[PDB]
Design a protein around this ligand. Structure first.
Ligand SMILES: Cc1cc2nc3c(=O)[nH]c(=O)nc-3n(C[C@H](O)[C@H](O)[C@H](O)COP(=O)(O)OP(=O)(O)OC[C@H]3O[C@@H](n4cnc5c(N)ncnc54)[C@H](O)[C@@H]3O)c2cc1C
Ligand SMILES: Cc1cc2nc3c(=O)[nH]c(=O)nc-3n(C[C@H](O)[C@H](O)[C@H](O)COP(=O)(O)OP(=O)(O)OC[C@H]3O[C@@H](n4cnc5c(N)ncnc54)[C@H](O)[C@@H]3O)c2cc1C
Ligand SMILES: COc1ccc2c(c1)CN(c1nc(C(=O)N(C)c3cc(Cl)c(F)cc3C(=O)O)c(Cl)s1)C2
Ligand SMILES: COc1ccc2c(c1)CN(c1nc(C(=O)N(C)c3cc(Cl)c(F)cc3C(=O)O)c(Cl)s1)C2
Ligand SMILES: [Cl-]
Ligand SMILES: [Cl-]
Lengths: 428, 421
């Protein structure tokens, strides 16, 4: 019905979105957010794709977010040699777009407040032992409800309770790599690079990507194993490194501001958490990074959490607001998918260490483009499937494996027919 | 050295043993056991080389080995009623059935045999720090206590570990497997053992499995593994009987025809939990051992044995490096984690293998095949189970050698097979 009450832990990206979706069903939705309100007081800007956008669309916020974003119509690949090679995101109608973390969060907290049947209680934490604190600490004044939604991010308190509950599978892995942000400013008030591209500098042990902001700049994030981060404790090491591996960056970024920004704070650890199931007896449910913290190697963390919100809302339609049905159906329907994108993201991260240089990224993608054009749509590349559709993640993995099977089997018969065809036309 | 104090959290198998090892180098060791003294207030399990070697190091091999029953072979009960004995490797090589409780008691007694050791029954732990908060005999008596070392030996659902889990660069995972387990008893028959008393008795089915281990009174304790789903479908005696008649037919006459009913409905199927974590320590002040650090699924007879080995390998290090905990704690994690992960893995592999590829017959063929090739080459083929059960070859090295063999044979017999035919 309308006048059941729900509390959302976390006023983050997913927390705020879910609040809107719920408010939009006339729930009494109270949001509790640890930090102080960001509109007065981890990444900087993220890649927003179809799944996130479809979820934004259901609350009528797609347009507002889309407008403050910069499109990325292509990948732009910065070879070691220096060669700049571009490859499009799918067809001409399909483009991911770069948006800012903060702008995204802010418009969302304001969208929460636009529903009079929704409030957002800033400066309220959830303590380690189910009490929500007020402004002044040790003011234990929690208050009960028909639903508690954990959107408290990757280091979720709500999940920490659920972990002690029974038949709850859970896993948390810090990967060897860490990430650090570095800005490319405008060169004479204009973007220093082609601004409707995702920029990549793919090496083997290291990786840099850069995404465009509106103020004509880019924010780059740098992935390398904490190992190498150890080996560059001095400014000469950093410079030496950038000169060796990232030749064209130094002019683009500030050659001396590079050094202020690198040593500003330490390479950030990336965490992977899986768990199952996502719910508990129609009283509690996890969502987004609280349910699934993935390594950031597919541009899907926020998108998938946004999609969680949506898939819930679809089930609330499909089962007339029965929480006792929706909560188990969410776990059943969605866990397979959220696990799959987790795996994909991890795999990508592994691939990224073994073999991507300037050259293989191009071959691998242009091969995929070759085969889509060859046999559309019986081959849709993976990156298209995740980025520009709502095909379920695990189905996308399936299709992706099957396809890979028929490319390998297909290539084999042609290799063999070459291999007998050459011999026959060599003997006679 | 004698100046330093250590707290062992848990007075179970690993706690009690570790407390001995530690007491035996004059630490002030205090064991804190949340249960009451079991000597005044897996019923039984499979002891082997690794555990025995640890026990030996502390002068308790003999005592424990006396109250155990040698198991010189596996004995496989096929659905037909056929009974095939597969030996353990060699005549010297045999595993032995012992009681969890006797084992625990003798060790609690050994702990107290040291004047510099104490065990504190009815004391639980709340919270700790690298200064800890233990609960008195009376609940809500949270006195603080301090030490130079805190040893998590508090089992699979470990409090100490729950603290380490919050720290940075700490990988952890728990997974409840889908089967639970239940103990049943095969009593004595006319005062004698109802089956060959020096075997590990197996009844392998696919969804199910039962094993049985001989006690000293002339009985066996069975542990039955089946999926919680299946357990759900047997609420009434008639159903249990009808099930048993299908799947384990020679059991209804072996077991108390209605002892089965007493024991089966005594309490519910127990869950099995795999937990893995890394690393096993927190900077020279806190270490995990046994199931605090590695709760493996009970399908290789090795959980107690590995955790016993932990205590020994810690000791080996404390010897190597003159009792420096700053060195021994990192070296513990560095040396032991790969091994303890390997045995966990082996176990789960086994647990899955049992769910498809073993009915009655493959167990016989796999083992006899294996034994042909060891006999053929006594130092290049040592079978897996021999390496774990009867040696201290490191677990991960045993997995290495095991895969290696598997390949040189797959290779060498795809060669004989494909080339000459
Ligand atoms: C380097 C990097 C790059 C990324 N790039 C992309 C990308 O290109 N595209 C994409 O889709 N995703 C990306 N992501 C993923 C994205 O950051 C997350 O998926 C997204 O933030 C999830 O939203 P959330 O609300 O679940 O978590 P969060 O955004 O972390 O929100 C959690 C909120 O809960 C609050 N909170 C926490 N604990 C408590 C408590 N106890 N009580 C009350 N409140 C609490 C926090 O203060 C915070 O406000 C990236 C992540 C990283 C790290
Ligand atoms: C069905 C089954 C079969 C098995 N078969 C075999 C086998 O054949 N061979 C083999 O080697 N191993 C076997 N095992 C494994 C064996 O049971 C365990 O390895 C062993 O008990 C681990 O010892 P531990 O002391 O670490 O754990 P435990 O024996 O669980 O000891 C933990 C102790 O700490 C106490 N404690 C817990 N929390 C606290 C707290 N907060 N404060 C104070 N005290 C606390 C508990 O009361 C308990 O007494 C089997 C296990 C099962 C379930
Ligand atoms: C800090 O903000 C961040 C951090 C990481 C990412 C993003 C924003 C956005 N990124 C996206 N990745 C894909 C993708 O499908 N894959 C396989 C790729 C993966 C990597 Cl790592 C890459 F460099 C390019 C592609 C590619 O194909 O463009 C998208 Cl689609 S968007 C990753
Ligand atoms: C409740 O008490 C329990 C529970 C499980 C076990 C035991 C006692 C003792 N068990 C031992 N397993 C091995 C072993 O090496 N393997 C791989 C085997 C694994 C299984 Cl499941 C099996 F049935 C036989 C063998 C076998 O070969 O004997 C030993 Cl060696 S001892 C498992
Ligand atoms: Cl992400
Ligand atoms: Cl075990």
């Amino acid at each position: 019905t309308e006048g059941k009450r729900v509390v959302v832990i976390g006023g983050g990206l997913v927390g705020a979105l879910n609040a809107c979706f719920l408010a939009k069903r006339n729930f009494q939705v109270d949001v509790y957010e640890a930090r102080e309100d960001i509109r007065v007081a981890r990444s900087i800007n993220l890649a927003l794709s179809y799944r996130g956008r479809q979820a934004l669309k259901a609350v009528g916020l797609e347009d507002q977010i889309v407008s403050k974003g910069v499109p990325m119509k292509a990948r732009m690949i910065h070879s070691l040699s220096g060669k700049k090679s571009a490859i499009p995101y799918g067809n001409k109608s399909q483009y991911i777009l770069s948006i800012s973390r903060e702008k995204l969060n802010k418009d969302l907290l304001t969208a929460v407040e636009s529903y009079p049947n929704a409030k957002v209680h800033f400066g309220h934490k959830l303590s380690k032992c189910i009490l929500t604190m007020l402004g002044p600490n040790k003011v234990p004044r929690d208050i009960t409800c028909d639903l508690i939604v954990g959107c408290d991010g990757a280091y979720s308190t709500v999940r920490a309770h659920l972990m002690k509950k029974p038949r709850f599978d859970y896993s948390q892995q810090y990967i060897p790599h860490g990430y650090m942000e570095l800005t490319i400013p405008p060169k004479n008030g204009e973007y220093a690079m082609e601004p409707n591209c995702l920029h990549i500098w793919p090496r083997n042990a290291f990786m840099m990507i850069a995404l465009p902001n509106m103020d004509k700049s880019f924010t780059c994030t740098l992935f390398m194993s904490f190992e190498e981060f150890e080996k560059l404790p001095t400014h000469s090491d950093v410079l030496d490194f950038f000169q060796k591996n990232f030749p064209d960056a130094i002019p683009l970024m500030g050659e001396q501001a590079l050094m202020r920004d690198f040593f500003l704070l330490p390479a950030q650890p990336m965490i992977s958490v899986k768990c199952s199931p996502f719910h508990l007896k129609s009283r509690c449910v996890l969502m987004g990074d609280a349910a699934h913290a993935i390594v950031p190697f597919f541009g899907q963390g926020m998108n998938a959490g946004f999609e969680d919100c949506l898939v819930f809302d679809e089930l609330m339609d499909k089962f007339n607001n029965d929480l006792s049905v929706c909560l188990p159906e969410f776990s059943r329907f969605r866990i397979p998918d959220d696990h799959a994108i987790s795996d994909l993201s991890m795999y990508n991260y592994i691939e990224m260490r073994a073999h991507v240089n300037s050259r293989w990224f191009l071959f691998q993608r242009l091969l995929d483009k070759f085969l889509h054009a060859l046999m559309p749509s019986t081959f849709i590349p993976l990156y298209t499937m995740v980025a520009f559709t709502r095909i379920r993640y695990h189905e996308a993995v399936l299709r992706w494996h099957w396809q890979k099977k028929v490319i390998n089997r297909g290539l084999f018969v042609l290799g063999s027919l070459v291999a007998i065809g050459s011999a026959y036309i060599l003997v006679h």
